[PDB]
Amino acid sequence: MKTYKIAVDGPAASGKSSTSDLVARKLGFSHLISGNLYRAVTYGLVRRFGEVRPGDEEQKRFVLELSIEVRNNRVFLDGEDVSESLRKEVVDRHVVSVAREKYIREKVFTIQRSVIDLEKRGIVVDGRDIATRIMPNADLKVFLTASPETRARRRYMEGGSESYEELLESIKKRDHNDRTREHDPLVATCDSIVIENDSMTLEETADEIIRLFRRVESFNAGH
């Protein structure tokens, strides 16, 4: 039985999770926010050790023994729901150093594919390496982006303590690290549909991804 798979990759604050949530809702699909898994590992390390040093033996051992569950995008660490902590500024400041570690990417890889394999209708998975690593044979691979300035302005309007320039710098730095790291970097491929949504609403972006999906669905079904 065929399960549909939509991959949504893109840089920081491009709208991937909110767009993917709406796409999934309109298609009757589930939605996995893969970055919550990296954020949860980051939070676990911060809380346990204070400093995040994922190459240290003690921290690596902690991560490997950690039981991570995700249910409706709530993430549990050894049974405890840590979802309300995943967007804390301290997690933001350290999640790149966690995500660069091969052994952590391997741990999270298995978790994501277990979620994907349980889906019986379709799933939208957002992240950085969904099209290149997690769902390399996704029916539709979307690379969702906008200018750094557009994305920083969006995040700025959400409120918070950072200035616009601080957000812009943080976004550019995180994007640069995600693009240049050794393992599973953020990259568009020739099989991606690149959507620049600077001049689009959230609903327009979701409706464009749905249009693209229906076009590949009809194409694939008959060819």
Ligand SMILES: Nc1ccn([C@@H]2O[C@H](COP(=O)(O)OP(=O)(O)O)[C@@H](O)[C@H]2O)c(=O)n1
């Ligand atoms: N066309 C759009 C798309 C998203 N947004 C907003 O931009 C913010 C970033 O969205 P997000 O958290 O889903 O983005 P990601 O970091 O998950 O890619 C949210 O507050 C969205 O509602 C917008 O203002 N205009």
Ligand SMILES: Nc1ccn([C@@H]2O[C@H](COP(=O)(O)OP(=O)(O)O)[C@@H](O)[C@H]2O)c(=O)n1
């Ligand atoms: N599939 C993924 C998802 C997230 N990540 C890492 O986790 C960080 C946070 O991802 P996110 O999706 O929660 O964050 P935003 O896109 O909202 O900035 C990214 O900047 C990457 O370092 C990754 O490496 N691979």
